[PDB]
Design a protein around this ligand. Structure first.
Ligand SMILES: Cc1cc2nc3c(=O)[nH]c(=O)nc-3n(C[C@H](O)[C@H](O)[C@H](O)COP(=O)(O)O)c2cc1C
Length: 158
C-alpha cells in the first residue's frame, strides 16, 4: 500500500505541499510517489487506487503550466463516466480568496473526477493565502482528515 501525489504548481507552493505529503506518507509507512501532473503518464490513472491531486489556481483562474496538458486531457468530452471507478481521490487546492475565481482549478478538478466515476475521500481543500496563517490554515486540518481516511483504506497489522 501506496499513495500517488500529483501536483500542479506555478510558484512552488503546491509542489512544497506535495513534498510534505510525501514526508507524512513516509512517517505512516506508506509508499508514495510525488510527481508533477504533466509528467505523470495520465493513462495510468485508471489503474491508480489512491490519488491526491494538489493544484494551485493561477492568473485568471487558470491551471499552472505544469498541469496544462493534464487539464486538456482530463476534460476530454468523451471520457467514460466509468473511467475512474476504481479510484479514491482527494483534491487539495491552493488559492487566494482575494480573487474572483477562488480555488477554481481544484474545485473544477474535484467535480470532474466525480464525473469520471472517482470516489472523493474529502471535500476540496480551500488553501487560502488571505488567512493570517496562509494556506496551512485550511491544509493542516484537511491533512489530518485525509490520514484518518487513508488509514481506513490501509489498516494497521491488527
Ligand atoms: C499572478 C497570480 C495570480 C493568481 N490568481 C489566483 C486566482 O485566480 N484564484 C486563486 O484562488 N488564487 C490565485 N492566486 C493565488 C495562488 O493560487 C496561491 O498563491 C498559491 O498558493 C500558489 O500556489 P503555487 O505556488 O503552487 O502556484 C494567484 C497568485 C498569483 C501570484
Amino acid at each position: 500500500p501506496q499513495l500517488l501525489v500529483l501536483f500542479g504548481s506555478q510558484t512552488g507552493t503546491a509542489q512544497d505541499v506535495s513534498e510534505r505529503l510525501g514526508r507524512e506518507a513516509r512517517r505512516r509507512r506508506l509508499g508514495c510517489r510525488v510527481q508533477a501532473l504533466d509528467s505523470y503518464p495520465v493513462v495510468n490513472l485508471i489503474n491508480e487506487p489512491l490519488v491526491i491531486f494538489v493544484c494551485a489556481t493561477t492568473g485568471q483562474g487558470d491551471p499552472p503550466d505544469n498541469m496544462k496538458n493534464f487539464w486538456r486531457f482530463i476534460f476530454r468530452k468523451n471520457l467514460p463516466s466509468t473511467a475512474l471507478c476504481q479510484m479514491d481521490f482527494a483534491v487539495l487546492g491552493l488559492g487566494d480568496s482575494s480573487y474572483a475565481k477562488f480555488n477554481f482549478v481544484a474545485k473544477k478538478l474535484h467535480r470532474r473526477l466525480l464525473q469520471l466515476g472517482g470516489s472523493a475521500l474529502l471535500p476540496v481543500c480551500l488553501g487560502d493565502d488571505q488567512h493570517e496563517l496562509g494556506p496551512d490554515a485550511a491544509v493542516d486540518p484537511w491533512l489530518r482528515d485525509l490520514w484518518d481516511r487513508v488509514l481506513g483504506l490501509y489498516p494497521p497489522p491488527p
